[PDB]
Design a binder for this molecule. Sequence first.
Ligand SMILES: *Cc1cc2c(cc1C)nc1c(=O)[nH]c(=O)nc-1n2C[C@@H](O)[C@@H](O)[C@@H](O)COP(=O)(O)OP(=O)(O)OC[C@H]1O[C@@H](n2cnc3c(N)ncnc32)[C@H](O)[C@@H]1O
Ligand SMILES: *Cc1cc2c(cc1C)nc1c(=O)[nH]c(=O)nc-1n2C[C@@H](O)[C@@H](O)[C@@H](O)COP(=O)(O)OP(=O)(O)OC[C@H]1O[C@@H](n2cnc3c(N)ncnc32)[C@H](O)[C@@H]1O
Ligand code: HEC
Ligand code: HEC
Ligand SMILES: [Cl-]
Ligand SMILES: [Cl-]
Lengths: 515, 515, 73, 73
Amino acid sequence: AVLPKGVTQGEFNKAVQKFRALLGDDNVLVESDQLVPYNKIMMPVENAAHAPSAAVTATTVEQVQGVVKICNEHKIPIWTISTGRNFGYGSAAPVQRGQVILDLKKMNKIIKIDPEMCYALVEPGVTFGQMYDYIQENNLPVMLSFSAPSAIAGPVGNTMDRGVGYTPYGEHFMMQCGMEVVLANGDVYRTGMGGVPGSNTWQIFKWGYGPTLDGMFTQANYGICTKMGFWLMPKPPVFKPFEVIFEDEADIVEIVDALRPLRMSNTIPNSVVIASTLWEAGSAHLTRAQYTTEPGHTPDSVIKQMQKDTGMGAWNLYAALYGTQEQVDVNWKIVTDVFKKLGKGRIVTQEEAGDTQPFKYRAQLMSGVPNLQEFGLYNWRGGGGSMWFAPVSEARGSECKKQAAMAKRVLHKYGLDYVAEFIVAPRDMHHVIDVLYDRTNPEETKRADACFNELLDEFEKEGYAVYRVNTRFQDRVAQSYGPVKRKLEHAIKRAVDPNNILAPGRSGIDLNNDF
Amino acid sequence: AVLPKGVTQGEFNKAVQKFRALLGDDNVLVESDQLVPYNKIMMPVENAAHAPSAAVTATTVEQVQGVVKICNEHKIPIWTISTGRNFGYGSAAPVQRGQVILDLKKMNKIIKIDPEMCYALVEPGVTFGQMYDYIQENNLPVMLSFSAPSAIAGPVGNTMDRGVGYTPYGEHFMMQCGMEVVLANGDVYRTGMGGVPGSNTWQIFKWGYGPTLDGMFTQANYGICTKMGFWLMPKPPVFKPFEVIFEDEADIVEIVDALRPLRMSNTIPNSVVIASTLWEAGSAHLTRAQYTTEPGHTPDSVIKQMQKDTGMGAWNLYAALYGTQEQVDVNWKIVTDVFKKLGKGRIVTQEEAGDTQPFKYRAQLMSGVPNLQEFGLYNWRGGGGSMWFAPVSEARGSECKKQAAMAKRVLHKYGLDYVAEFIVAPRDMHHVIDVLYDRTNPEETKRADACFNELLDEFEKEGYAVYRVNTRFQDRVAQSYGPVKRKLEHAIKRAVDPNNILAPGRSGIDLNNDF
Amino acid sequence: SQWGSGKNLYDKVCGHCHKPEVGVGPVLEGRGLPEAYIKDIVRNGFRAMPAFPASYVDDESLTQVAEYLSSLP
Amino acid sequence: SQWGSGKNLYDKVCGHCHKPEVGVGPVLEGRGLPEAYIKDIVRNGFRAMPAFPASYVDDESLTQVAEYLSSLP
Ligand SMILES: *Cc1cc2c(cc1C)nc1c(=O)[nH]c(=O)nc-1n2C[C@@H](O)[C@@H](O)[C@@H](O)COP(=O)(O)OP(=O)(O)OC[C@H]1O[C@@H](n2cnc3c(N)ncnc32)[C@H](O)[C@@H]1O
Ligand SMILES: *Cc1cc2c(cc1C)nc1c(=O)[nH]c(=O)nc-1n2C[C@@H](O)[C@@H](O)[C@@H](O)COP(=O)(O)OP(=O)(O)OC[C@H]1O[C@@H](n2cnc3c(N)ncnc32)[C@H](O)[C@@H]1O
Ligand code: HEC
Ligand code: HEC
Ligand SMILES: [Cl-]
Ligand SMILES: [Cl-]
């Protein structure tokens, strides 16, 4: 059946025999029926291309050390997942056909949540839902940060891919402090202060001494993360979410330039999300089929009608205010006067859009309470086809108009929509585009793959590169960053993983490459 | 004369010949009289132990590539410095006797200072003084962050050692974004977004794609930094510095615990410095000799008298408030009410301690204006002996009392003083101790070396390790973090520097070690 | 039991998309859908709906959620 | 010239410690200290005072600062 690249049936059988002896029978999965749920992908390619050979489930660090020991003996490529909810990025499926999946979902212990120092030390399988229950049950004054998958996703996996949230602690890797990784040679390495016997500073001081290597492991294949610590925001006494609706599409240029100094001075402490009409629509659970059944993209005419019927704008911005009532009231006056001086957009408060969607879910995401509302984006066209295309730019308004026109032009060419949002951070602007299509339709699927390649080519030409991408385009994106980087990355890979067992192909790092 | 470890006179002469042909004659220094200023150290050891064999000065990246090419040919160990003002950490002198100094002081071009996106891209030789002039001349609304050496020190060198400042952008490495390093093989690697052709995001988005390696280069010897970018704080319309003087030494326990939530919620955005009497004294330019001439430490009696004469407390805290007048007035009320509820300490404003020292220098350091006032600390006992001993702990008040007593006991044993300050960050607290002694007195020098070793032993036993240390104790501190870390660090070293030419010994990383 | 009860697996996972007030997925409450069907949709996933491996939601919790869903109005 | 004038090197480097109002180092203004002495202190450093290499402060700027110091009251 499905076998690892370069491994023979007999050599694979010796490996599976050793996996069983170490882990047990119910922890080693080799049958198609139990391997099928790992194969579910939203990428424009057949399942066979990212089909795993086996799936092992470890619960302890000693077991992970055992698994890599066996993998080195029989040159078995292993793909590590934590919660495996990487939708639009490859899901739980390997980067290459035939790798064994090291599923650490069962390694789900919340080791410590300090309510005074405000940190958490967790294992891979811990979900944000599991963490939220523990925080609500034990009445801890901490707040959590996550993205839409929230409840079903986890801190470790999201951070290993350097994911983002919507609270002031939204830059997840920036709030990460301390991690434990098991290297290819079985050694257990702890970053920062973790290597010091009897220390209580692992989740307190980031760097440690000597080279600080947490970053070396994120978006890489040089170790398997078994423990990870991060900082938690103390729960503020007052939370004030707001929305600003904008009628015209050209308004994006003036909004971003007006919002940047407020975001840079920390007056608006969380990342400001400016959502397009179609993003706003899919999240409010409207489908394309209830407006038009015509082929190709959704015309400007129907988008204009969607705006009229619902009251949603061309651009819908969401942000929040945190602190004491007095500091919130002061920051409120500063934010209000900026929008008044601009003479555009209407302010929508928690008073006005009470229990209404999409305000309710965004307000929840901005205060760390889980909900999966934004999954409606997959109902816009349906079919289970979705890929994230997300380049980065300066938080400059002229960059919005430039990138939007570029994206819109390539999307429409293939009959796909411009479903996007800008996430404005202090200096960096993120153009998150969800290229949504119908994966059950083979013709639309072939166009989506083509559309994705062209979006990469078009943007790379104007100097833009993506910072996270699906498994299928991981080697391609590695090329946007140049040869020296790739040469350095393969040099480190030969040093820590001589046998090329640790997820070869992840971020374009594979020893079978000529670097 | 002085030669590199393992290099013969003839092999060194071929290398110096090639250095001359590449750089010129006035860029290659081999005579004792021009090499002597690099040798000046405040460490308790004779100059001969950290004496360089030569000193080359490069001005371009192509020259640095040429230097490493020559160094690989004749196995010449190279020690890189930028501004070389690393006082109390090794200064500009090598970690090992006989290495050649790559002095990049002349590579001093300010490449770009964006006043809108608020960033700077500089070369190694740029000083904070040079940057401050450029900012004052060109009327840019940016603020700079640095420590006491300020004017004469630089952004690149301070950040390569992960140094700290006193403004909200005080955690320098956290504000670093994009760097260019030349590897041992002559390759020019750019982190984050710098590898992407035509990009304008190098100083905008930190991570990039794939493993993010900026941290791998800091406090390490895997590359020579030739360019570095960092974020600059936008100049706030209102700056409000303040001081809180405390009479009793036991007050430190209640101060820290009361200040932590204000520092964690960002009400006090800059790192709170709580200075001891002797630190405060040395910075106000008082010497020990004008109070007592008795041998050993300064007795509690005279410290009590120093407090009476000057009005300085046992602990003197300095912090600042930034923003608009309205947000400053609100944060002022919150800070004021916390000190009132505690019933301890008196508030000293900019109104009261006008042009008085030490308030004036700390207020300047907190607003990015350079001054070298704190160099008075070297006048406390004089002689030019100074080493920094700085462990890290949780920002917990009980930790102040514990570490202080431990430090004070070991310092007094050897006749040295407890000159220290706590720098309270959101969760971490730094115990910066300046072990000051007279380096001209050979007996006091031998005791200082012994005192330093014992402070490391004593603290390591209670689970504390330092995160930055002088060149002489760099191999020793590497041991506090464990063997696996050292094994991983030497594995990466073999991969990027097979010939062991890039500063062997830096942070305990040397290929002549058995790891 | 991995999720304890069927009501628990529903409140913590399924309900986040399926509860009538949310509406990402169709209502499953009191529709009488067979356990064998609920198992194949969860293990294979269905178009917009993701798949959950046994490690996340085991066979036993699937039986419990199937039973909890039938018993509701 | 590296620092342009002698007054410039003084204002940018030396004066930060040496100007009478600061007081980290002794007053150098109008004391008539020989150029050869000012060169040896800067190149060797002196106890609390650090050393500056030629790359930082060249021989020519040292002559200029020596001359600027003598000419003051
Ligand atoms: C569908 C949807 C997805 C979204 C989203 C909105 C919608 C509607 N919005 C997102 C957003 O704003 N921000 C994000 O960062 N992501 C968004 N996503 C996608 C989301 O599913 C993921 O970001 C994230 O939660 C991925 O899921 P996960 O948390 O389960 O992570 P993972 O287990 O899949 O691991 C991710 C990746 O990391 C590597 N790997 C994982 N774990 C390890 C360990 N322990 N050691 C080494 N490598 C590891 C691996 O390559 C894996 O694929
Ligand atoms: C005397 C004193 C020193 C202080 C201080 C107070 C006083 C009174 N307070 C400090 C503080 O609060 N914060 C700090 O972080 N440091 C304080 N210091 C020490 C201070 O001198 C240093 O922090 C700093 O300014 C060091 O000087 P520098 O800026 O000149 O840096 P450097 O050139 O000496 O480089 C430091 C270190 O970095 C490595 N190296 C340098 N440049 C490179 C490149 N390009 N590539 C690779 N490695 C590089 C090298 O090991 C060097 O020694
Ligand atoms: C959001 C991410 C979901 C979670 C969590 C669960 N389900 Fe789901 N489910 C979802 C969608 C969007 C759909 C419709 C898919 C389509 O393309 O039509 C579904 C559908 C089902 C069905 C089919 C019902 C039918 O009317 O035929 C079943 C039986 C089902 N889902 C079950 C189910 C269970 C048991 C879940 C928890 C383990 C669960 N779903 C979670 C979206 C989401
Ligand atoms: C602070 C970091 C200093 C800077 C910058 C400069 N000097 Fe200095 N200098 C400093 C001190 C603390 C001392 C006293 C040292 C001691 O322990 O006695 C000095 C001393 C001198 C002297 C000798 C003065 C005398 O003998 O009366 C000279 C000639 C001198 N310094 C010169 C000098 C020049 C030219 C500088 C700029 C290039 C300079 N100093 C900078 C501290 C500091
Ligand atoms: Cl996917
Ligand atoms: Cl030193």
